[PDB]
Design a protein around this ligand. Structure first.
Ligand SMILES: CC(C)CN(C[C@@H](O)[C@H](Cc1ccccc1)NC(=O)O[C@H]1CO[C@H]2OCC[C@H]21)S(=O)(=O)c1ccc(N)cc1
Lengths: 99, 99
């Protein structure tokens, strides 16, 4: 779909059999989700924002479904205030910016 | 133009007579710029993100020029690691997400 930006660009994702709302974030390099129940192994990692860093668990090769599209890639799980879909996923569903 | 997301959606902006590189950030409600010399009055404000919060100076009715397109609105200045063009400006230049 085409999405204007007068509101936050929220989309419904399905990941690990769970339904969540996440922000389409062109300013995010990778995908970060609030604390969630994901299966498998993971390697620690820290990511920085506008206020500093957070420590997260990096899961590899995780299936995400967004508004009918499917993507596999790295998902970071940690104390983010909001679920964010980063560029690593949006490239796989063909998301573009247009002005 | 149309912008894929395989790399950071960086653009060049003209503000306060200065040229700067900024990241088009659909995940940012407000525009936040690194420390820079801006004229006018302002009000203190704090904004939050990944890792915590930061103190910024809130400038209102500030002119921004991106790819010729002109916008006017609130510009926050403070210790952000990256210049961010938020939804408050992208809406004025007709920016949309498309997938
Ligand atoms: C977390 C969002 C709800 C809000 N953020 C916008 C977001 O795009 C930031 C904007 C951003 C971009 C670069 C550096 C700091 C902040 N990017 C970010 O945190 O991404 C991190 C996760 O993947 C990595 O990608 C880059 C940093 C990592 S934010 O920077 O904190 C922000 C919050 C409020 C306003 N008014 C303006 C900006």
């Amino acid at each position: 779909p085409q999405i204007t930006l007068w509101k936050r660009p929220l989309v419904t994702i399905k990941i690990g059999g769970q339904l969540k709302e996440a922000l389409l974030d062109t300013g995010a390099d990778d995908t970060v989700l609030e604390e969630m129940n994901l299966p498998g192994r993971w390697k620690p990692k820290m990511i920085g924002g506008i206020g500093g860093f957070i420590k997260v668990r990096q899961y590899d090769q995780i299936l995400i479904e967004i508004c009918g599209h499917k993507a596999i890639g790295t998902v970071l799980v940690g104390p983010t205030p909001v679920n964010i879909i980063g560029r690593n996923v949006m490239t796989q569903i063909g998301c573009t910016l247009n002005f």
